[PDB]
Design a binder for this molecule. Structure first.
Ligand SMILES: *[C@@H]1O[C@H](CO)[C@@H](O[C@@H]2O[C@H](CO)[C@@H](O)[C@H](O)[C@H]2NC(C)=O)[C@H](O)[C@H]1NC(C)=O
Ligand SMILES: *[C@@H]1O[C@H](CO)[C@@H](O[C@@H]2O[C@H](CO)[C@@H](O)[C@H](O)[C@H]2NC(C)=O)[C@H](O)[C@H]1NC(C)=O
Ligand SMILES: *[C@@H]1O[C@H](CO)[C@@H](O[C@@H]2O[C@H](CO)[C@@H](O)[C@H](O)[C@H]2NC(C)=O)[C@H](O)[C@H]1NC(C)=O
Lengths: 42, 49, 49, 49, 49
């Protein structure tokens, strides 16, 4: 579905949220804290 | 013999190789805030006086 | 501000230089030596902003 | 100015990267501003095989 | 007037010895320079002398 970029993971630094859906994509330059890609859907 | 505030003790420094990394053991160093010139990038700068 | 316009900040301490056209907005503690600090922001570890 | 150089070549018949020359063209370009040194992707985990 | 000190005094009244450094770094002949403690020498291998 998409790609993830950034550095140091935690909210200490910002990150990327590339993802596609049907006929859409959204990007977010935000300090995203996570642990795995699991984008629940299908 | 640290002088009083009203009569402060001024010292002039002459031509010297000054290393601002050995004085950390000279005082407890409760506060070491510094102004525009940074203490980290302080041992790479040359001063008039 | 007659009292203080403490609404603007700027960094002084970085591990290295900075390339052109990017931002280094982050709230961490500068090591400023081998002396390790963890958010203490005391002596030998100064707030970058 | 993120680059999305892409092309669709469904002529593959099973071999991984079959010997052949093909071009790539960007689609969408946009600057964000970040020190990126990490890469990851998202997979269809809820229904995989 | 008198500025005596007592060990029984708590925070805000204890004697705080203070030393301030003033720098006049400007486009002028330099008398004091902070060094790199120097890096040791090597032979028979290409280096930036
Ligand atoms: C693709 O996913 C995005 C979020 O990842 C969703 O965006 C929605 O788009 C519709 C279009 O009108 C809006 O009304 C919603 O408010 C959006 N949601 C969010 C959370 O922003 C949507 O699922 C897809 N994008 C589309 C359809 O443009
Ligand atoms: C200010 O400087 C020092 C710091 O307290 C005082 O002590 C002498 O300073 C001279 C340099 O001017 C040195 O050569 C001496 O070695 C220092 N010690 C002694 C015991 O003389 C100096 O007296 C102070 N001067 C004042 C307050 O007028
Ligand atoms: C992007 O951020 C990472 C965060 O770790 C940087 O990695 C650090 O870089 C500094 C400066 O070179 C050094 O302390 C180490 O190489 C790294 N430290 C740690 C703790 O990982 C990386 O250099 C940054 N990239 C850019 C271009 O600034």
């Amino acid at each position: 579905r998409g790609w993830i970029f950034g550095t140091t993971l935690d909210s200490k630094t910002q990150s990327l949220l590339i993802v596609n859906n049907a006929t859409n994509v959204v990007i977010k330059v935000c300090e995203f804290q996570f642990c795995n890609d699991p984008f629940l859907d299908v | 013999r640290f002088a009083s505030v009203y009569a402060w003790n001024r010292t002039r420094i002459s031509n010297c190789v000054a290393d601002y990394s050995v004085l950390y053991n000279f005082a407890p160093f409760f506060a070491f805030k510094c102004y525009g010139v940074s203490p980290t990038k302080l041992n790479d700068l040359c001063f008039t006086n | 501000k007659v009292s203080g316009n403490y609404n603007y900040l700027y960094r002084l301490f970085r591990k290295s230089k900075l390339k052109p056209f990017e931002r280094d907005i982050s709230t961490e503690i500068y090591q400023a030596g081998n002396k390790p600090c963890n958010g203490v922001a005391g002596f030998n570890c100064y707030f970058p902003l | 100015y993120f680059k999305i150089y892409s092309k669709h070549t469904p002529v593959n018949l099973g071999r991984d990267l079959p010997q052949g020359f093909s071009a790539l063209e960007p689609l969408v370009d946009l600057p964000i501003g970040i020190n990126i040194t990490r890469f990851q992707t998202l997979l269809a985990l809820h229904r995989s095989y | 007037q008198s500025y005596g000190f007592r060990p029984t005094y708590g925070v805000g009244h204890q004697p705080y010895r203070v030393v301030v450094l003033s720098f006049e770094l400007l486009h002028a002949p330099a008398t004091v320079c902070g060094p790199k403690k120097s890096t040791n020498l090597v032979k028979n291998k290409c280096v930036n002398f």
